[PDB]
Amino acid sequence: RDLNDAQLKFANDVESRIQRRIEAILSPIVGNGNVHAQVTAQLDFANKEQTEEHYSPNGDASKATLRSRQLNISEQV
Amino acid sequence: RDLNDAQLKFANDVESRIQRRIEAILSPIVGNGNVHAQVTAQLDFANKEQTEEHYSPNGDASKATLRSRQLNISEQV
Amino acid sequence: TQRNETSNYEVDRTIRHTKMNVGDIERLSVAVVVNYKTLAKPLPLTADQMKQIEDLTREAMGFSDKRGDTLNVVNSPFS
Amino acid sequence: TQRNETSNYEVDRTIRHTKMNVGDIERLSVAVVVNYKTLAKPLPLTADQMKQIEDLTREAMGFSDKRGDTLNVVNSPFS
């Protein structure tokens, strides 16, 4: 209930802010009382944790970062 | 009971908000008393936890991120 | 011939832990009535006026057809 | 012939631990009405004036079509 009313008041606050700004940026052009605006905004309220972990591609040997190597080559004829 | 009445009052609150906004955005065009609106909204009240875990496709060797390798190649003729 | 290959890869990742909200909107259903316009009386609003009124009501709804919102606007003489 | 190769690589990395914000905007929907201009009365605003008013309202919105914001501006005589 109280969280719901807090969400509704916060939504109405953001609507009032954007509505007042649209009324202020347009009224010097068309006149003081010749415009109305209404704002309906959907908000999110879900806590969203995230953890990316990128890696860099090292397929090509010209940008590989080796640590060891054990290259053996035999041959006969 | 009390949770049910809280859900009903919160639904009625959101209905009142959207109804007042539709009455405010339309009445300057058609007139002060020539419009009515009614809003019926279905709400959710189920707590929904979620845990995605994406991975990135590394089938192609040109974007693979190797850590080891042990390539042996024999041959005879 | 022969070719033995052992590999070890490394994987990118993402973990999203989302606790959704209790009390959001799943669907809107808005029914709008408008009166006829009486000038000097039986004059319905024209199709362009009804279309732009539908536009305004759709935008003031926050209309989103992903949620399946429904809007119906009619014009009729009042009483 | 033969060729045995063992390797050990080393990997670059990145770890982003992002705790997102509670209370941000997902979508804006803005409906704007403007009156006709009365000079000496039935004069609608021209198409360039409506276009630049749409420009100003879009920029004052913080309009971002990634979020799917919707704007509709109409011009009509008041009452």
Q: Which two tokens stand for residue D47?
A: 């198409």
User: Chain A interface residues facing chain B, Cβ-Cβ under 8 Å?
Assistant: 1, 4-5, 8, 12, 36, 38, 40, 55-60
Residue A34 C-alpha from the chain's centroid: 36
Please give the radius of gyration of chain B, using alpha carbons only, rounded to the nearest integer.
Answer: 31
Residue of chain D whose alpha carbon sits nearest to that of A61: D9
Contact list, C18 vs chain B (CB under 8 Å)? 49-52
- Give the pairing type, strands C70-75 and C25-34: parallel
**Distance in Å, alpha carbon of B27 to nearest chain D alpha carbon:** 9
The two counts, helices (H) then strands (E), for chain D are 1, 4
**Distance in Å, alpha carbon of B32 to nearest chain D alpha carbon:** 8
Contacts of B25 (CB under 8 A, 6+ apart): A36, A38, C56, C57, C60, D31, D33
Closest CA to B14 of D21, C62, C65, C72: C62
| The length of chain D, given as a count of residues | 79
| Residue B40 to residue B22: CA distance in whole angstroms | 13
Instruction: State which H helix or E strand residue C14 sits in.
Output: none
Contacts of A45 (CB under 8 A, 6+ apart): A7, C21, C24, D22, D23
User: Chain C interface residues facing chain B, Cβ-Cβ under 8 Å?
Assistant: 1-20, 22-35, 37, 45, 53, 56-57, 60-61, 78
| Residue A10 to residue B15: CA distance in whole angstroms | 17
Closest CA to D70 of C6, C65, A70: C65
**Distance in Å, alpha carbon of A16 to nearest chain B alpha carbon:** 12
Is A38 at the interface with chain D, CB within 8 A? yes
Contacts of C14 (CB under 8 A, 6+ apart): A50, A51, A52, A53, B52, B53, B54, B55
How many B×D Cβ pairs under 8 Å?
47
Residue of chain B whose alpha carbon sits nearest to that of A59: B62
CB C26 within 8 A of CB B44: yes
Instruction: State which H helix or E strand residue C1 sits in.
Output: none
| The length of chain C, given as a count of residues | 79
Listed resolution, Å:
3.7
Contact list, D35 vs chain B (CB under 8 Å)? 28
Q: C62 vs D29: CB contact, 8 Å cut-off?
A: yes
Contact list, C26 vs chain B (CB under 8 Å)? 42-44
